[PDB]
Amino acid sequence: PEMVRGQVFDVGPRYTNLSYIGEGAYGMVCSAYDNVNKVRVAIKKISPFEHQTYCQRTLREIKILLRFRHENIIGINDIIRAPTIEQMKDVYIVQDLMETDLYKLLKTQHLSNDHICYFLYQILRGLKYIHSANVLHRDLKPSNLLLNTTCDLKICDFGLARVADPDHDHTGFLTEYVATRWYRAPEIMLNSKGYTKSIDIWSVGCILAEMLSNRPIFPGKHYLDQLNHILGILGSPSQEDLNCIINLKARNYLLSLPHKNKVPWNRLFPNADSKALDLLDKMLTFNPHKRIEVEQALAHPYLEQYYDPSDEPIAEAPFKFDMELDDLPKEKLKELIFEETARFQP
Numbered sequence: 472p473e474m475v476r477g478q479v480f481d482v483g484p485r486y487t488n489l490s491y492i493g494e495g496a497y498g499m500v501c502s503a504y505d506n507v508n509k510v511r512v513a514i515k516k517i518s519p520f521e522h523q524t525y526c527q528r529t530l531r532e533i534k535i536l537l538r539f540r541h542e543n544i545i546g547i548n549d550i551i552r553a554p555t556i557e558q559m560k561d562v563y564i565v566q567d568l569m570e571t572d573l574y575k576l577l578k579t580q581h582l583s584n585d586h587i588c589y590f591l592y593q594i595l596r597g598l599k600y601i602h603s604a605n606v607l608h609r610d611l612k613p614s615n616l617l618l619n620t621t622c623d624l625k626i627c628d629f630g631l632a633r634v635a636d637p638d639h640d641h642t643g644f645l646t647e648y649v650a651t652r653w654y655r656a657p658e659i660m661l662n663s664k665g666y667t668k669s670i671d672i673w674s675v676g677c678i679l680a681e682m683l684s685n686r687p688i689f690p691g692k693h694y695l696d697q698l699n700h701i702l703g704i705l706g707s708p709s710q711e712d713l714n715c716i717i718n719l720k721a722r723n724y725l726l727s728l729p730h731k732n733k734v735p736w737n738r739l740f741p742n743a744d745s746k747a748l749d750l751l752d753k754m755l756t757f758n759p760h761k762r763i764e765v766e767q768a769l770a771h772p773y774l775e776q777y778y779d780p781s782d783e784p785i786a787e788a789p790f791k792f793d794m795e796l797d798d799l800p801k802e803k804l805k806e807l808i809f810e811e812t813a814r815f816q817p
């Protein structure tokens with residue numbers, strides 16, 4: 472069994488010449504030569520069977536990625552595991568090798584308007600498919616957008632994804648949330664569980680703003696500071712938008728703040744294309760009900776050079792988890808992971 476930095480990275484004989492390419496979702500990732508397709512691939516090692524949350528997120532990612540088939544969503548090419556549940560300790564997931572991601576690209580590279588437009592198009596094209604399957608990604612951010620050397624873009628990491636559930640979206644004020652803080656929509660801090668499609672659109676808006684300046688637009692340092700950042704740019708919500716927030720603790724918090732005026736997008740992004748800023752405004756709308764939807768965003772003039780709804784496929788059917796994964800014991804989850812990965816065995 473081959474080793475990488477003192478770890479068991481046991482993928483062969485199909486996959487040889489391991490080069491370490493960093494750490495990610497649940498640990499070690501290497502590129503490797505696939506001796507069957509004759510290309511380098513990425514392989515991630517998952518060791519999740521101790522912990523219920525690890526198993527839940529692993530199972531959720533596998534079920535979704537195996538069901539999805541889209542050019543802008545990372546596929547699973549292969550899964551390596553032991554032949555029996557008793558011997559299964561790790562799972563290796565083999566995916567197309569993507570040389571970089573938008574987090575790394577933004578730390579080092581200025582994007583042309585043409586690149587920003589193309590990246591945004593591919594993000595929305597992928598998101599149209601995800602939403603058409605009644606799935607919410609819920610953790611869109613630059614590091615979950617993979618890019619290859621020709622700038623093909625693929626969304627990854629469906630570990631926090633959920634089936635959409637708008638009739639159960641309501642919650643109290645300051646309800647804790649799992650997804651990455653800088654890309655959280657304002658309503659998460661106020662009255663939302665992140666069970667509607669508008670949650671992902673806000674993330675995309677944040678990603679667009681970050682592509683325009685190479686800096687995150689709302690870099691909050693902790694839970695409520697994230698809302699301070701958002702309101703610092705959008706300004707105080709309107710009476711109508713406050714009236715949509717029925718929860719008193721949430722409403723009254725917002726009423727307690729001094730008045731803040733909107734920062735014009737063209738002052739934050741003086742070099743941006745005006746059509747990009749019109750689309751940004753519509754994605755970063757405070758009221759989730761007024762927020763642009765993915766299909767409308769694709770049809771926006773900013774994306775006219777690429778928009779073609781006949782080449783923007785949807786899922787053949789809505790997604791549904793068989794059981795509520797959030798209260799299954801880890802032995803049933805190991806067993807479900809074994810079953811879900813069975814198709815890749817001899």
Ligand SMILES: *CCC(=O)Nc1cccnc1
Nearest residue numbers: 493494495614615627628
């Ligand atoms: C799908 C998320 C992903 O692979 N992102 C990433 C992992 C490790 C290092 N850099 C990016």
Ligand SMILES: C=CC(=O)Nc1cccnc1
Nearest residue numbers: 492493494500513568569
């Ligand atoms: C640590 C980086 C990483 O996980 N890289 C990766 C993932 C998927 C596809 N290509 C490359």
